Design a protein that fits this description.
heterodimer, A: little secondary structure, 0% strand, B: Leucine-rich Repeat Variant, elongated, acetylation (chain B), Importin subunit alpha-1 (chain B), cytoplasm (chain B)
Chain lengths: 12, 425
Amino acid sequence: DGPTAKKLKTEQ
Amino acid sequence: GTVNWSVEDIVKGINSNNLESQLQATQAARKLLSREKQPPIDNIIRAGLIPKFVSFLGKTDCSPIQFESAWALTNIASGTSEQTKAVVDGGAIPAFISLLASPHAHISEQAVWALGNIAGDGSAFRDLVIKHGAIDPLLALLAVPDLSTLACGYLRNLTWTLSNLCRNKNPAPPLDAVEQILPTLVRLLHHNDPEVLADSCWAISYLTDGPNERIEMVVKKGVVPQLVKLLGATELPIVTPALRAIGNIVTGTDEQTQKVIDAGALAVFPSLLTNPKTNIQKEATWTMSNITAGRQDQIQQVVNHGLVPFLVGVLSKADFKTQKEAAWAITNYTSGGTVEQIVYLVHCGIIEPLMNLLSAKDTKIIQVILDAISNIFQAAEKLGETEKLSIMIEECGGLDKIEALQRHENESVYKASLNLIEKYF
């Protein structure tokens, strides 16, 4: 596991 | 207007006594924090911006600064633990949970995203998010007759956040949070969006990665057939977590394992076991190993589904890590199978690939193999076929590898190895 824990928002 | 500001301009605007100036500088901060390409998260933190952004979360009167600051704080929380910790330390959690009730869908989605980054940090922030009451308002966002009416990126985000509330293990999420979330998770699992599916399966995989009681909570929701269906999906991002979940379920009790068998999982394994993605092949073989660790009637299902040749094929040629799971699957099969199942296994050609793997510079696979060999010899004893098997092992060069394994400097290797040579060769 696994897919990302955290996500940066780059776009609206 | 708000492209390429310096941090000190941002500070200057945020510190102005002017809500619009603050708004503009927050948006500048957000546009900075959106350029990764290494966003200046530490610069923003070091500027003391976080408490100001957090206070702008509460500016109901100014929806856009709520949003910009939510977004900025989201992106800070996306960083290292220390960066997420800065956001949390600012009081962002309750402020983000308040924004979940926002009438602006883009703002409540932002608050969802932020809370997912925070929960995504690990158990402690996950559980802190849960203590602050995130789950009701998160779940309430999905309390619609039909998930299809929700914006896709929106649903995907909720699903993702909720999966991070399901995630991590020391400790696992609170049992009551898991129970509260599971019904919505079961529903997202039937949703027709590949990303919502991927993340639902991941959430389910996290929930089944635990003790049997945890596996049971999920198995009881009746999800196993849907997991099995997802396992057949063409999207690798769905297959990967459906299989992790299925795999986790079969490390449970034989009764939980049987649910996966009854759901028709074994019919997918010819594919999975030959899957071109080596991760799927490894995990399918691992899953196989925890089904062959089951009851003889479960081993029988493995046999009946035609899966033993697929185990032989994985044992013959796979990435090493998959071959090692296959070795496990075979030991478990041989330790638990009837004599007839074990004979069957040999008729499928287990011996030569098993012997070829004694050449591996990996001490646990040798012990797993020797142990499978012993189990097979033990079945051959029950039939007086120890000679016929000894010859087989000798013809494929297996005796040479067992003989050379007394010169091996490991307590159980030379012991089981000498035991076999002395006993049969």
